[PDB]
Amino acid sequence: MPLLTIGDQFPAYQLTALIGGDLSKVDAKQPGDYFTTITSDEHPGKWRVVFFWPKDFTFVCPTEIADFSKLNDEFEDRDAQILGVSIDSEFAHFQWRAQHNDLKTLPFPMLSDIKRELSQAAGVLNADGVADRVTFIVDPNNEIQFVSATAGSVGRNVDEVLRVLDALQSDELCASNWR
Amino acid sequence: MPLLTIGDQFPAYQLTALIGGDLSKVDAKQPGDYFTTITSDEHPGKWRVVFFWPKDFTFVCPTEIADFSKLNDEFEDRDAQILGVSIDSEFAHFQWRAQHNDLKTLPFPMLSDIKRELSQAAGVLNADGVADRVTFIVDPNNEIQFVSATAGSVGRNVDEVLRVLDALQS
Amino acid sequence: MPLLTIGDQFPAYQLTALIGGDLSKVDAKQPGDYFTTITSDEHPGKWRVVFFWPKDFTFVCPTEIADFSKLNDEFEDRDAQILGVSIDSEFAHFQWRAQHNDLKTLPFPMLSDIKRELSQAAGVLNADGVADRVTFIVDPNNEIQFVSATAGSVGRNVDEVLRVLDALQS
Amino acid sequence: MPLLTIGDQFPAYQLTALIGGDLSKVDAKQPGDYFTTITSDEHPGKWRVVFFWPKDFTFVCPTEIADFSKLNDEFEDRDAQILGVSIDSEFAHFQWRAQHNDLKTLPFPMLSDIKRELSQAAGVLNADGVADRVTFIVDPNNEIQFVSATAGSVGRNVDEVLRVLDALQSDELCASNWR
Amino acid sequence: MPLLTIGDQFPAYQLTALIGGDLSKVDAKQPGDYFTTITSDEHPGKWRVVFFWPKDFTFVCPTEIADFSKLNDEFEDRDAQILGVSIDSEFAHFQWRAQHNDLKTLPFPMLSDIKRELSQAAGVLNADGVADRVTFIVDPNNEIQFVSATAGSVGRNVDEVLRVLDALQS
Amino acid sequence: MPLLTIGDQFPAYQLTALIGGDLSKVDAKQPGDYFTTITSDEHPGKWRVVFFWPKDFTFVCPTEIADFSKLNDEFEDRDAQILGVSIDSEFAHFQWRAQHNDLKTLPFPMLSDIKRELSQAAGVLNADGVADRVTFIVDPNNEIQFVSATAGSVGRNVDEVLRVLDALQSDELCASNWR
Amino acid sequence: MPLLTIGDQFPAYQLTALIGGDLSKVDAKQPGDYFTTITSDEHPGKWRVVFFWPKDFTFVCPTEIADFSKLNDEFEDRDAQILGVSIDSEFAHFQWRAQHNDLKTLPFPMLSDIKRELSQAAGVLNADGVADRVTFIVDPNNEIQFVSATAGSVGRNVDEVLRVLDALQS
Amino acid sequence: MPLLTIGDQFPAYQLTALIGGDLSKVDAKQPGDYFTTITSDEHPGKWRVVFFWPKDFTFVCPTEIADFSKLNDEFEDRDAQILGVSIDSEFAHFQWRAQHNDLKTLPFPMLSDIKRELSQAAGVLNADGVADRVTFIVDPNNEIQFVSATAGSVGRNVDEVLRVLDALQSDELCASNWR
Amino acid sequence: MPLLTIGDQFPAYQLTALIGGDLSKVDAKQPGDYFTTITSDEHPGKWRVVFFWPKDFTFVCPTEIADFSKLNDEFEDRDAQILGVSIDSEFAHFQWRAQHNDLKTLPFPMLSDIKRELSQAAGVLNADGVADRVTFIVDPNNEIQFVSATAGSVGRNVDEVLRVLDALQS
Amino acid sequence: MPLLTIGDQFPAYQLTALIGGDLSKVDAKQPGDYFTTITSDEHPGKWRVVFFWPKDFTFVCPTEIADFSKLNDEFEDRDAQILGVSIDSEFAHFQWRAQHNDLKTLPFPMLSDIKRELSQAAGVLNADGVADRVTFIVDPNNEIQFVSATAGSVGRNVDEVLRVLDALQSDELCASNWR
Amino acid sequence: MPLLTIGDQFPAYQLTALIGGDLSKVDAKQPGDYFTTITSDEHPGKWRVVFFWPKDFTFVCPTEIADFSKLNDEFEDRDAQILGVSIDSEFAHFQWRAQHNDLKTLPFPMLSDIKRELSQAAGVLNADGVADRVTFIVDPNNEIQFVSATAGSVGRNVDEVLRVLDALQS
């Protein structure tokens, strides 16, 4: 039940995830081809950008999803792995990504924290029993360098996150130099 | 040691603060004319926007500074009060605002959390002994609706927080 | 952690549910027009037939689905209320019932046990973190008269449970 | 929370300090050139003269500062290292020493006890949360031979301290022989 | 074992003392005519200046002694009472003041803390079993506003303490 | 806080003492020439005759002091070391022995029990915080063979003590044979 | 196990005693005519002089014995009561006083502390199981003003104790 | 505080005793010639006949003492050692045996249980603090074969004790055969 | 496990007993005509003489037996009641007194302590599981004034106990 | 205080017993010739038939005693040892067996459970403090195969016991076949 | 786990029983017409004779069976009620009595101790999980006057128990 802040080690985890990318391209030889297990050891040397939201089927003002799909290149260029998380099942992730045209090409994985152990460990599980809208940046040493949490149904600003990451990785001093 | 998150009651507080507004536009009747005491009960019905930073006298970006001053009206119009915090003394707030031209016209108060009790209560005091670079939004019920924390020396985006507040109010 | 058996009081509950009945036959006055809150006190004098499954959006057999809809009248005639349960959100129930033709006309409500408190109280939450594939029959005294649990992905026989209910009522 | 007296070992410490001396002379290649870490092991064989005050930006009647700058030679001549301490940050020390013309040449370091661990350990932290106006003399064996504490906004008398130190180091008997 | 600092309440006390003033100028009606009992309640509204030393009959500097006697008026004028203390007996105070010409005219009382209870309560009793060489200034609220402690055999500066008292009173 | 009786071991001790004998004869090269440390191991093979009194500056009816100075020969003749004790400082002992003409030649040492540890250990410290008027005789085995304690301001009878010692050392049976 | 010293309350007591005075000058009406019970309450306003010895029938010196009898008047004149004590039985006191010419005229009572409770309470009972050779002087408040203890078989000086009592009374 | 019965081990003891026999015959070179230490190990192979009484100076109806002096031969003939005990001192025993003409020749020792440790251990110490009138017979194995206790001032019957001892040592069955 | 001694209260008791007196001189109206219950309250004002033995049917000496019967009058005349005790049953007392000519005329009662509670309370029950060969004399206050215990098979002397009782009464 | 049932191990025991058989035939050289010690290890390979009764001198309706004397042959023929028990002394057993003409020839031993330890261990001691009327059959493995307990003054039926034993030893099924 | 003996209170009980008497002579109005509930309070003033056996359907001897039926009158005449017990179900009692000619006319009830609570309370439940072969006689005060237990498969003697009961009643 505690929430983590700057400097804290991000929790270990091992969760089933819906793969990123175009769903129609993976060969459909068995259902398990759509899913994988992802661990806290999965992205060595990379920064991890972790997005929690309460429930699949979210309809907040962003619009941020198309920006995920275009900006994953910017994250990769910055040795950054995007990871999305809710407590919904991988089949809910699957359902969400397959028929919401915008999500058909989401380029990064969707983790199912169905035991809530990770949401719990991160301090993100709320009184309704779901993950709050929270963003974490974790450095290659597994140390949190940024966390953002939002109430209600407020959309996330990803471009701000790119700026924050860049400033963290480059020692740029001014919010104004990012373009 | 605990960090508050959305939905938590923001801590009570009572701290000496350097006043907001045009700093040169003040009578020298007492040193205390530049200072006030600020409490969690002081603005009923207002949203409270709290900015923690580690230390005054560190380089801060001007574009981030202009707004507040251009946007302070936009926060005010919707019953939102800006509040700044570090553990430095109120005289340090005074000095920072008195000698650096950008801060001369800062429109909001600067609170001095010198015993670090509030930084402790919010969960923002870090291993270096200072308040983390943190933003809180508190609704009229003293309830947190937004929290943001940053490592190192990353500049803050005030326009983003205005965006968030407006969206929180719809 | 305890599984209820025959004679045990079925747990109290209060959960958001997707309504039963023709799903397309509903006014779009609010999103909440598709949803309701359901409690253990809601149908005094009725038998309650509770079906738990792990996850929506898994393949389910159509012949098992038709009845309910052909047999729902037979359950209803003898004061029996059908209830479905998974831990998925009510929006997942909505999506499953909205996009798969077989479920478009499902005549009974779908409850979302998202905190998993009821799955816990019934003893059906398993090591994978989900409700077991379980059926309960509860008499008008809130007393369990039948329980069934299944591993894996075995399809349920609704006609058998109707048989059992009828025999329990004689 | 205890205060130390004659004969007690002065606490160990390790604190960031603003360097003494003319600020304009150190090369400004990076900010860290203005600061150092100072430890209780930093001045072997020397007596340590430790001055606590509540807050930078102090405006008490002394005048003592110019006397620091002239008297550091007397302290050094007496194998004595002057050390000033408040809980303000090294940037507050920096601000204080750079634009108060009198402080521009303060010849000894300014320590930042921002965690209050040293003020706490010495018994100097007060009910307002700051270091009281206290002077300590510590011998080369780390043993306190003199402590003075003052309320409010009373200025310190440094010449008295020189006399006390001299009498401690020379076994002079009379307050009257010092000149 | 605890040493009091600024702001602490000075301990209560009740001790036999050798009187201040011209020592030869006293009637020999009883031995007790040379002695009195002194308490913490004895001078309401006065500041109290307390000097502890280890042992009487040790060499003390005359220039430090003259004032008190030239400056005793200056302390008195502003409601300040001088008090001397060692753990030696009151008869030792008597002997020291009776046989050493410098002390013949000492204008203030000498208290005998023979059980060492006050030295203990002030935190001044040291590892040699004696009161440290200590000065306290106590305000009319019994609150310490100044404390000074010295090792060894360093002579005290009375003029400095007068300076401090005057400044404390402004 | 307990008082010792016949057969008990006298406490160990280590105390600063004012030397016995003519004060004007010892060379005054430094103050420390007037004083020594005396321990419970200081007089091997000797009986110890220990006199406690409350305060230096005592003016009781004896007169016993001149008898100390004449009778120390009798004590020595009897392998007996006289030891006087109060809680006053060695400087008080010094003051007492230097200007009371009678005490100028006191031939035995004056111990300062300023920590009261010995008065405490012997059971001699009283409710006023000082040593009661008590006499002990301790045999070469450190065993008490006689103790006498007196209230108020009653003078001690030393000749009685000589008789007691002699009877203890000679197995003389009658109070009447001593002359 | 504790030995009383000056200022301590002398213990309460109630013991059978052989009477003082000319022993042959007594009626043989009962054996008990030679004996009495003595308590700590028996002589209000008197000083009490208590002599403990280990055992009766041991050689005691005559010169020490005459006074008491010549000096008993001097003790009596100033409200002082002499009391003797051993743990031997009262019949042993009787025998000692009845057969040894010196004791025939002993003017004060001899108490028998046969259970050794008083020797215990005064702290005088020793490792041999007997009362030490001890003298106490007790003032009219039951308060000890003098105590003396001796090893072995040292004869007591009664004249010294008279001296001390007189001086205690001035 | 417990009293011992048939079959119990008699307590160990080590006590000063007044010797038995004619007092005028032992050479009077020192007082210690009249006394000895007697232990529970003092009479190996012998039965021990132990008589407790409250106080020396006893004047009960027996008359038993002359019978002690004549019957000690019968006891010895029966490997029996007579032992008398009270809590009075050996000097009280001495006083009793020296001038009561009847006791001048008491042929067995008189033990002083002045610490009451033996009276206590045997269960013989009474509420007045003295040994009750009790007789014990202890066999060569230190085992009690007979105990008799009497209230008040009732005299003891020694001839009965001889009969009891004889019956114990001979397996005689009848009280009537003893003569 | 504790043995009572002089001065101790003799235990309370309530036991079946074979009557004293000429045994053949009794009506056979009931078996119980030969038996009675005896308590510690039964003879107020009498001394009680209690004899314990291990087992009936063991050889006992006749001369010791005659008195009681010749001396029973002497005990009775001074308010003394004889009482016999073993743990054997009352029928064993009956048999012993009925078949052995010496016992036919035994003038006092024989108590059966079959649960051994009294033997326990008096402290006379031994390691063989039986009452020791013990005599008690108890005064009218239920207070023991004499106790005697014997090993083995030593015959008792009744004349001695009569002597002792008479002397106890003077 | 517990009572034993089928399948339980019979308690260990070691008790003095009056011998069985004609009393006049054993040579009367000493009393101890009439008695022996009997232990739970005394009858290896035999079944033990144990009869408890409250008190010697019993006069119940059986008549069973003559049947003991005639039936001991049947018991022996069946490897069975009869044992009688009460808490009365062996002298009470002796008295009972010597003058009740019927008992003069009782062919089996009479045990004295005078410490009640066996009656206690078997659960047979009653609120009056005596053994209840109880019968046990114990197999060669020391295991109880039958127990019978009766209130009051009801006589025992030994022929029933023979039948029970025979059925236990032969696997005969019917109560009717015994003759 | 404790076995009751003579003098112990027989346990309370309440058990379903197969009725005694001619079994074919009963109306088939309900299955329950063959069954009753029996309690320890059901026959005030009667002696109760309780027979436990391990299992029905084991060979039992006919001669032992006839009486009861010839002797049931003799028990009844003196206020004695026969009761049979095993842990088998009442339907097993029914089957045993219904199909085996000897049992067709059994005149007393057969209780089913199916939870084994009474077998437990009487101390008769054995290591095989069944009631020992046990007989109890209980007097009108619910007090046991006789108990018998047997190993293995030893046939019971009913005539002996009648003998014992008669003798207990005299």
Describe the protein.
Chains A, D, F, H, J: Keywords: Antioxidant, Cytoplasm, Disulfide bond, Oxidoreductase, Peroxidase, Redox-active center, Stress response. Chains A, D, F, H, J: Residues 4-170 form the Thioredoxin domain. Chains A, D, F, H, J: InterPro entries: AhpC/TSA, Peroxiredoxin, Peroxiredoxin_AhpC-typ, Thioredoxin-like_sf, Thioredoxin_domain. Chains A, D, F, H, J: The active site is at residue 61. Chains A, D, F, H, J: Its EC number is 1.11.1.28. The structure is cut from a larger assembly and holds eleven copies of chain A. Chain A has a seven-stranded mixed beta sheet. In chain A, strand 4 (80-86), helix 2 and strand 5 form a beta-alpha-beta unit. Chain A has helices at residues 64-77, 90-99, 117-122, 158-170, and strands at 14-18, 35-39, 47-52, 80-86, 110-112, 133-138, 144-150. Chain A is globular. Chain A has one domain (8-170): Glutaredoxin, CATH 3.40.30.10. By secondary structure, chain A is α/β, with parallel strands linked by helices. Helix content of chain A is 24%, strand content 22%. The A-B interface holds A 2-7, 61, 123, 126-127, 132, 144-152, 154-155, 157, 160, 163-164, 167-168, 171, 173-176 and B 2-3, 5-7, 59, 61-64, 123-124, 126-127, 132-133, 144-157, 160, 163-164, 167-168.
Class by SSE composition of chain A: alpha/beta
Number of H/I helices of chain A: 4
Q: Any idea of the CATH class of chain A?
A: Alpha Beta
Tell me the strand percentage band of chain A.
15-25%
* Oligomeric state of the chains in view: part of a larger assembly
Helix content class of chain A: 10-25%
The biggest sheet of chain A, with number of strands, parallel, antiparallel or mixed sense and barrel status, is:
7 strands, mixed
What is the name of the CATH topology of chain A? Glutaredoxin
The largest contact between protein chains, plus residue counts on each side, is: A-B, 33 and 35 residues
- Annotated CATH architecture of chain A: 3-Layer(aba) Sandwich
Q: How does the overall form of chain A come out from the CA principal axes?
A: globular
Going by CATH, the homologous superfamily of chain A would be Glutaredoxin
Give the CA-CA distance, first to last residue of chain A. Answer: 39 Å
Order of helices and strands of chain A: EEEHEHEHEEH
For the record, the count of structural domains of chain A works out to: 1
The radius of gyration computed from the alpha-carbon positions of chain A, rounded to a whole number of angstroms, is 16 Å
Count of DSSP E strands of chain A?
A: 7
State the strand order across the main sheet of chain A.
2-1-5-4-3-6-7
Subcellular location (chains B, C, E, G, I, K): Cytoplasm
EC number (chains B, C, E, G, I, K): 1.11.1.28
Catalytic activity (chains B, C, E, G, I, K): N(6)-[(R)-dihydrolipoyl]-L-lysyl-[lipoyl-carrier protein] + a hydroperoxide = N(6)-[(R)-lipoyl]-L-lysyl-[lipoyl-carrier protein] + an alcohol + H2O
Protein name (chains B, C, E, G, I, K): Alkyl hydroperoxide reductase C
